[PDB]
Amino acid sequence: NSLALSLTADQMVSALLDAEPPILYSEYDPPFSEASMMGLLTNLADRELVHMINWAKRVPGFVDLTLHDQVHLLECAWLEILMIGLVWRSMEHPGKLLFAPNLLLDRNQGKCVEGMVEIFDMLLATSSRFRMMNLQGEEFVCLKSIILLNSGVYTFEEKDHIHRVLDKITDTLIHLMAKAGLTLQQQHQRLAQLLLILSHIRHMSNKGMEHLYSMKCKNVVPLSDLLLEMLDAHRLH
């Protein structure tokens, strides 16, 4: 009934690649304060979110879900998705986080915002991990799609559809690895390695979400209505 299930691995890959959101820029003004850095990161994320929704609607199988199930998955996974994107962009910049082409931050600038250093370090560790694994663009788009469909699936037939689609993406990841000349053992080992990193990304999202709660209570940094609604989805409890 769906459609995504009929796709070949190559079609799945092309569809995901084509669905990719654009790299957005930060504001073109330069010595950050806590309010300044959080302002830039928040404004950026807010703008990225709009494109994420477009990207989501174009992830095979996602459009087959009811509006409410689509909302649930995005509310659950929005920060994980931003983070894996950030991590991916930063791969080629060891020790730095490429939030935007005109916003490249090192570990030290994390100390500007209190509690940001720990978050930064985790992100950098993930980026380094991806770099050392030589993560390919085709693998990255599979991983990101997996996060979208997986993270909120247990907080809910619809589940079956989602799990069938996740299988499809697994098939696609293995196909990519077999294509790169990996042995069967290397394929399984690599699949597992990549999927385990997803656990860390979830951890970073939760830790990150925790701080965003508190920063909202601090009431010093403005948060867009959209982010507030995305945030509040977690802020219980």
Partner: peptide, 10 residues
């Protein structure tokens, strides 16, 4: 209701 609703539908 939710801004997310509008974004998805549009």
């Amino acid at each position: 209701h939710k801004i997310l609703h509008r974004l998805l539908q549009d």
